[PDB]
Amino acid sequence: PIQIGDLEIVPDAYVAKKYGEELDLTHREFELLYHLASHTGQVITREHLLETVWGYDYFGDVRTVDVTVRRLREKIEDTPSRPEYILTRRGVGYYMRN
Ligand SMILES: [Zn+2]
Numbered sequence: 001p002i003q004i005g006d007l008e009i010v011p012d013a014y015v016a017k018k019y020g021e022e023l024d025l026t027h028r029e030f031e032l033l034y035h036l037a038s039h040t041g042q043v044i045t046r047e048h049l050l051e052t053v054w055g056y057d058y059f060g061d062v063r064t065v066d067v068t069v070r071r072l073r074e075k076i077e078d079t080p081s082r083p084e085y086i087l088t089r090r091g092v093g094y095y096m097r098n
Helices: 027-039 046-054 063-076
Strands: 002-004 007-010 015-018 086-089 093-096
Touching (some): 007 027, 027 063
Antiparallel strands (some): 002 007
């Protein structure tokens, strides 16, 4: 389990909580969230997130990652337009705050 600010990720139960309340994430949104929080503040490229979270039938289409991050941000960020949990590293990828 991972606790970051007001966010808690429970891998064994596939649940994410914000202010202690279970969030309504798709399986893919949870796996993205968990994958990001599992690298713990290291930057992950879009291609890397595709290969691990989506898989082979998704090789070229990095835009799926950006679309899913935006949807995840709307669900977990206090201010989705100024995110604090899921962070962008310009031109390389995404990472979870330390
Ligand atoms: Zn990884």
